[PDB]
Design a protein around this ligand. Structure first.
Ligand SMILES: COC(=O)c1[nH]nc2c1CCCC2
Ligand SMILES: [Zn+2]
Ligand SMILES: [Zn+2]
Ligand SMILES: [Zn+2]
Ligand SMILES: [Zn+2]
Lengths: 286, 131
């Protein structure tokens, strides 16, 4: 039994030296014997590898005292409707030196904002994990043609995450003490949040008594939506997957049952607007 | 396409620590709330006649220890996150780490909580002959 979380997407045929492999599964077969691994004299470590590690398959189902649940119930989400921000991400595929994972390309929100990122991945090396630009391409097909020009209009992730925090803070500071990301088929949105979200115990802001919604890697400080200028991470966001509420077909077909003012323009922000809109009609209309 | 590195028993703990502001504190808290330690480490077959030093080029477990591949006992390597060093590089990856047998059920937690003596090369409280 294995998982796809942290799958090695490199094209290297062999596994790793016992000192460099993060896990027993990832050690090369040549070192495996008698239920464990052996060091083989004369077989050296590899000092030049770059192995892309997939961030698909996170499971946020822990129950740790003092840490809030990220995923919330429909009833809790309804009480926090003012915090709702629809969120959708269109990805590009790892290519060339790696294959088998999706990287965030266009991040869209129900505010109408689309942010484009440079295709970036988590590349294991002999010394660390290098968060870096990786070779990528949009998926093939006429429905993914619009992503082609976005491959050369991306911003580095350190800039993108600052923009997400600024956008959420400007939108929500006078509406809610939190954010509830409204999602449809959450897997890739949760992978994308690895790039701009941090979690921990509930905290208060550095300049007031409001709960912290943002974190800064510059000073290791916390801020609410009012005091987050320059902050780079969203801290303890909440989220809900609308698809888990009994719907059977795709997002557009379910959205269109209740609404006709949101024509599908086939962009991450339009999917984000449609997801929030569908959740609003389901919980509040009639 | 690709080759799996992990098993389902570690999915929850690794996801929790990969998102945390303070990964070492999250791992400690996860254990205190009843979670299972990270498994699937690289445990070595050795002769248990080694020097007993904490971090070595080849397995050096003595009769009170077990030898593991270094990257597999490092929370930052396991979660593919930043190392809390100034240059962001790892001191365990590329080495073998000797862990006291009594602590061998949780090698990642052991390395997070303990310190190596720079004079004798052995773990403080688990072999250090300095004081
Ligand atoms: C001399 O400082 C240390 O004790 C030390 N240096 N690196 C590590 C440790 C202990 C934990 C494993 C990695
Ligand atoms: Zn504040
Ligand atoms: Zn609508
Ligand atoms: Zn490490
Ligand atoms: Zn000593």
């Amino acid at each position: 039994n294995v998982t796809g979380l942290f799958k090695d997407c490199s094209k290297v045929i062999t596994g790793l030296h016992p000192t460099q492999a993060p896990t027993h599964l990832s050690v090369d077969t040549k070192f495996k014997t008698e239920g464990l691994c052996v060091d083989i004299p004369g077989i050296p470590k590899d000092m030049t590898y770059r192995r892309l590690i997939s961030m698909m398959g996170f499971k946020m189902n822990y129950q740790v005292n003092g840490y809030p649940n990220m995923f919330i119930t429909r009833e809790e989400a309804i009480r926090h409707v003012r915090a709702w921000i629809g969120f959708d991400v269109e990805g590009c595929h790892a290519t060339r030196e790696a294959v088998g994972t999706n990287l965030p390309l266009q991040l869209g929100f129900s505010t109408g904002v689309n942010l484009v990122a440079v295709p970036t991945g988590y590349v294991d090396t002999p010394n660390n994990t290098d968060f870096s630009r990786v070779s990528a391409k949009p998926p093939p097909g006429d429905q993914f043609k619009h992503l082609i020009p976005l491959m050369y209009k991306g911003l580095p992730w350190n800039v993108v995450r600052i923009k997400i925090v600024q956008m959420l803070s400007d939108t929500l500071k006078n509406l809610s003490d939190r954010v509830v990301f409204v999602l449809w088929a959450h897997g890739f949105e949760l992978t994308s949040m690895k790039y701009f979200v941090k979690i921990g115990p509930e905290r208060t802001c550095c300049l007031c008594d409001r709960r912290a919604t943002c974190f800064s890697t510059a000073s290791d400080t916390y801020a609410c939506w009012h005091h987050s200028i320059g902050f780079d991470y969203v801290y303890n966001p909440f989220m809900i997957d609308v698809q888990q509420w009994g719907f059977t077909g795709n997002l557009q077909s379910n959205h269109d049952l209740y609404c006709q003012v949101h024509g599908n323009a086939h962009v991450a922000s339009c999917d984000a607007i449609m997801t929030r809109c569908l959740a609003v009609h389901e919980c509040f209309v009639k | 396409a690709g080759n799996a590195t992990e098993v389902p028993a570690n999915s929850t703990v690794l996801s929790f620590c990969a998102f945390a502001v303070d990964a070492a504190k999250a791992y400690k808290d996860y254990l205190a709330s009843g979670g299972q330690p990270i498994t699937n480490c690289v445990k070595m077959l050795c002769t248990h006649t080694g020097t007993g030093q904490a971090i070595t080029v080849t397995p050096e477990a003595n009769m009170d220890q077990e030898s593991f591949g270094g990257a597999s006992c490092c929370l930052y390597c396991r979660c593919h996150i930043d190392h809390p060093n100034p240059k962001g590089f790892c001191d365990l990856k590329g080495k073998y780490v000797q862990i006291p047998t009594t602590c061998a059920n949780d090698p990642v937690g052991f390395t997070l909580k303990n310190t190596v003596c720079t004079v004798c090369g052995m773990w403080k409280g688990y072999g250090c002959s300095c004081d």
